[PDB]
Amino acid sequence: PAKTMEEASKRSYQFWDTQPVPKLGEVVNTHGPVEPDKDNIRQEPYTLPQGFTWDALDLGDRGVLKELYTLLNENYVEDDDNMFRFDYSPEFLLWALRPPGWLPQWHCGVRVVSSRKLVGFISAIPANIHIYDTEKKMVEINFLCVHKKLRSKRVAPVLIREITRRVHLEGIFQAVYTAGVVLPKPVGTCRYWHRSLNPRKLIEVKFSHLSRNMTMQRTMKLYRLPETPKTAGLRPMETKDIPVVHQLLTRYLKQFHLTPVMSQEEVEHWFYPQENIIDTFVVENANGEVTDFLSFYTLPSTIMNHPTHKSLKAAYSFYNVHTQTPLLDLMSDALVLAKMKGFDVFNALDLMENKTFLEKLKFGIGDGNLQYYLYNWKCPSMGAEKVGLVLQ
């Protein structure tokens, strides 16, 4: 793969040159589809190599959900040095893959014919996306995974074409997705930052290591946190808060250039707290008005090849809306809440207004860029601070 724009300039993209995306080299000054909507769609699934078959995964079958968990737990994204792998839980996967409007045929698996072993996956979920001055029904593509023994055999281009076909069959012709690799052609480039919460554990697993020159003692004291949040009236989101959280989010996001447009049902799905999946806290002020909220989701990782520590418990910044409480105070309380809940690290991207608090709250810049992409939509790229969209 190509993780930098340098190694990507030196590559030729045999697959992506065939797709309706802009070329890496060109710069974009227009707004609109790369190609028109198709009015006739291929009815037949694309051909797989011999011995493999398509299978749409019904995640309501607990056994099928577990097969997908295992495939991802063993074969999904790792860090650059093969030390950590994402470990999405089964319940998290249900959250991410069954939002309102989900379709079973958009949970697109590949199985071995003989054994029935799940060896490949890709998914789509519908979302309304606001991109500059246009709102489009799109899909979000997530969880592209090919078994390790099956790699470098073109299975991934077939998975992309097959989910494209199945999305086209439903009348949708644009998509949004992210990746750690550079591809034609990022609409924005964001950077992960990390806030140590349990610096001891993070150093013995080499997730981070001591800054020069500092002792383990100095490092702990530097990252210590209060034991309770400071903001008045902070409390977990409840059912009664769904409309006002929807209203707050909708107004807050109008200031960015790539955002979701959520219905009130989608707000309930994405923010209503679920233990070990998503946490949302609202600020209810002295008048009983909800004026701010913070949210973060739960995504641990496997620590590979380690005798004693098997997993890292990571919290990920989701959407944080402020209208009365300072963003800095809001995020400082998110750190405290994550610490209280047992998380080892708190991750956040530099999108939206996050740059205004990352350094002050002692985040350390990561080695990973997260590139954002649109399929069949041509528009100018944007700076990270204008991206107002967070995926799982």
């Binding site: 860090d79 981070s208 080695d367």
Partner: peptide, 7 residues
């Protein structure tokens, strides 16, 4: 979607 660790 992409696994980062401190630079």
């Amino acid at each position: 979607x992409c696994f980062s660790k401190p630079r």
